[PDB]
Amino acid sequence: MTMMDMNFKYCHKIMKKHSKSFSYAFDLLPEDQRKAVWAIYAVCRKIDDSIDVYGDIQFLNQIKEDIQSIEKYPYEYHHFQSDRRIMMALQHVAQHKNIAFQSFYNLIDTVYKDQHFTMFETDAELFGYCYGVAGTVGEVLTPILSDHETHQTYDVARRLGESLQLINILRDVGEDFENERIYFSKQRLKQYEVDIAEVYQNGVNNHYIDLWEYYAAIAEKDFRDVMDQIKVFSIEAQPIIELAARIYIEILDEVRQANYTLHERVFVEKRKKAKLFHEINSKY
Numbered sequence: 001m002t003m004m005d006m007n008f009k010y011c012h013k014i015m016k017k018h019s020k021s022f023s024y025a026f027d028l029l030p031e032d033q034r035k036a037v038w039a040i041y042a043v044c045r046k047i048d049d050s051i052d053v054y055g056d057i058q059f060l061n062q063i064k065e066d067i068q069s070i071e072k073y074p075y076e077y078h079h080f081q082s083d084r085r086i087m088m089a090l091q092h093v094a095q096h097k098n099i100a101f102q103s104f105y106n107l108i109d110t111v112y113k114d115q116h117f118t119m120f121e122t123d124a125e126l127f128g129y130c131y132g133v134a135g136t137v138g139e140v141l142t143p144i145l146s147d148h149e150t151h152q153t154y155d156v157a158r159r160l161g162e163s164l165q166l167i168n169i170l171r172d173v174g175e176d177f178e179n180e181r182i183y184f185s186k187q188r189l190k191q192y193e194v195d196i197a198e199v200y201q202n203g204v205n206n207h208y209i210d211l212w213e214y215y216a217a218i219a220e221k222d223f224r225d226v227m228d229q230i231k232v233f234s235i236e237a238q239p240i241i242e243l244a245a246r247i248y249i250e251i252l253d254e255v256r257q258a259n260y261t262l263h264e265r266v267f268v269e270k271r272k273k274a275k276l277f278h279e280i281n282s283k284y
C-alpha cells in the first residue's frame with residue numbers, strides 16, 4: 001500500500017468508528033467515490049471533535065487554516081497544522097473534485113457558535129442549526145455523489161443532510177440532555193407543555209410523545225421528498241443514498257419500539273441493515 005492509501009484507510013477507520021450505518025452504506029460506493037467520502041467524513045468528524053482536544057478553539061483554528069491552504073493552493077505541498085493524514089487525503093480529493101469550501105467554513109462557524117450554545121427560540125433556528133452541521137456536509141458531498149451538479153442536486157443533498165440530523169436529534173434526546181444540550185425549540189416545547197429535564201427524571205408522557213412525533217413527521221416528509229428526487233444523483237450512488245436514508249428512517253421505529261427512552265441509544269441491527277439493502281437492491 002502507498003502512503004496515500006494509508007491516509008485514506010485512516011479516514012475510513014474514523015468513519016466506521018463513528019457510524020456503522022453510514023460506513024455500511026457508503027463503503028458500497030465504487031472505490032474512488034467511497035475514498036472521497038471517507039476523507040470528507042473524517043474532516044467533518046475532526047471539526048466536530050475539535051473543541052474537546054484542549055478545551056478551546058486552538059485545534060479548530062488549525063483545521064480551518066489547513067482547509068484554507070488547500071483551497072488557495074490545491075497543488076502545492078503543505079505542512080499541515082492539524083491532522084496530516086486527513087488533510088493530505090482531503091487535498092487529494094480537492095485536486096479531482098470541485099469542493100464547496102464555503103460549506104466547510106459554514107460547518108466550522110456552526111461549531112464555533114456551539115461553544116456559546118443557547119437553546120433555539122424557534123424551529124427556524126433549529127433548522128438553521130441542522131443546515132450548519134449537516135446540510136453543509138451534504139453540499140460538500142454533492143460533487144462526489146453526482147455527475148453533473150445543479151442547484152437541484154445541492155438542494156436535495158442539503159435536505160437529506162438536514163433530515164439525517166433531525167433523526168440524530170430524535171435518537172439522542174437523552175444523551176444530549178446529559179451533555180446539557182436540548183435541540184427542540186423553546187416555542188415547540190412550550191406549545192406541547194414539555195420539560196426535557198422533567199421527562200428525563202420521570203419518564204415519557206403523552207405530551208412528550210406528541211412533540212417527538214411532530215419532529216419525526218418532519219424528518220419523514222423530508223426523506224420522502226429526497227426519495228422522490230433520487231435521480232439527481234449518479235446511478236451508482238442512488239441505491240447507496242436510498243440505503244443510508246432507509247437505515248436512518250428505521251432508527252425512528254427503533255425509538256418507538258424502545259418507548260422513546262431517554263436512557264439508552266437505540267440502533268438498527270447490522271443484520272437488519274443487510275435486509276433493507278436486499279429490499280432496495282432488488283429494485284435496482
Ligand SMILES: O=C(O)c1ccccc1C(=O)NCc1c(Cl)cccc1Sc1ccc(Cl)cc1Cl
Binds near residue numbers: 158
Ligand atoms: O452528526 C454529527 O454529530 C455531526 C455534527 C457536525 C458535523 C458532522 C457531524 C457528522 O458526524 N456527520 C456525518 C457525516 C460526515 Cl461527518 C461526513 C460525511 C457524511 C456524513 S453522514 C451524511 C450523509 C449525507 C448527508 Cl446529505 C449528510 C450527512 Cl451528515
Ligand SMILES: [Mg+2]
Binds near residue numbers: 048
Ligand atoms: Mg455533534
Ligand SMILES: [Mg+2]
Binds near residue numbers: 176
Ligand atoms: Mg447529536
